[PDB]
Amino acid sequence: GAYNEWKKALFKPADVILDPKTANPILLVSEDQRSVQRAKEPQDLPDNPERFNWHYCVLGCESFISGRHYWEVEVGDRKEWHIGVCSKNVQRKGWVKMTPENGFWTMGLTDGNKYRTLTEPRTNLKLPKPPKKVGVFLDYETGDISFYNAVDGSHIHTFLDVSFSEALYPVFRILTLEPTALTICPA
Numbered sequence: 447g448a449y450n451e452w453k454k455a456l457f458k459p460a461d462v463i464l465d466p467k468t469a470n471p472i473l474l475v476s477e478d479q480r481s482v483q484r485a486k487e488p489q490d491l492p493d494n495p496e497r498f499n500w501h502y503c504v505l506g507c508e509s510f511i512s513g514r515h516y517w518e519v520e521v522g523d524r525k526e527w528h529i530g531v532c533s534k535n536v537q538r539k540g541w542v543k544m545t546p547e548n549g550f551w552t553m554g555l556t557d558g559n560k561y562r563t564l565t566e567p568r569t570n571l572k573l574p575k576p577p578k579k580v581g582v583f584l585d586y587e588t589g590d591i592s593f594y595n596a597v598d599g600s601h602i603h604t605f606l607d608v609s610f611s612e613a614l615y616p617v618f619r620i621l622t623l624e625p626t627a628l629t630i631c632p633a
């Protein structure tokens with residue numbers, strides 16, 4: 447459909463690989479650096495400055511300061527996940543609420559069937575069909591971060607007209623231990 451035919455004409459396909467130095471110690475990044483899973487217990491890793499030490503998050507290796515970019519994530523039948531972008535200077539040590547005011551523009555799924563925007567306060571989304579693949583779209587200059595169902599092209603949510611000042615990284619968060627990973631679709 448138009449989603450597949452047009453996405454690369456309008457947004458540059460990012461090749462997103464997960465950065466293991468950023469991943470909370472309870473997360474596992476695959477060898478190909480496209481998938482993340484959770485362990486039962488935190489692994490023994492350094493508490494280096496880049497690492498999220500409280501939130502179960504991991505970033506992409508590359509950030510954006512301009513332009514239009516997109517990537518796609520296979521959420522599959524996971525019951526819990528949140529994805530989007532965050533500022534380079536978010537608080538990585540200790541808790542902060544993941545909200546736009548704190549430098550996070552994310553949405554996702556909790557409890558199998560509760561889709562939300564991670565706004566302050568959180569807002570519930572009503573999705574007619576559960577997505578299996580989500581496209582994440584950034585237009586830095588217009589300030590828009592949009593999410594689409596990458597199979598049928600349907601709109602999930604847009605953060606509109608944000609005045610970004612920092613570099614933005616792709617961010618991914620998983621809280622649950624489940625058989626299916628969260629995986630980036632390769633460009």
Ligand SMILES: CC/C(=C\COP(=O)(O)OP(=O)(O)O)CO
Pocket residue numbers: 500501502503542543544564568619621
């Ligand atoms: C502490 C458990 C955690 C995320 C949950 O953060 P919290 O602010 O409680 O909830 P949401 O962001 O609304 O899901 C680890 O990333």
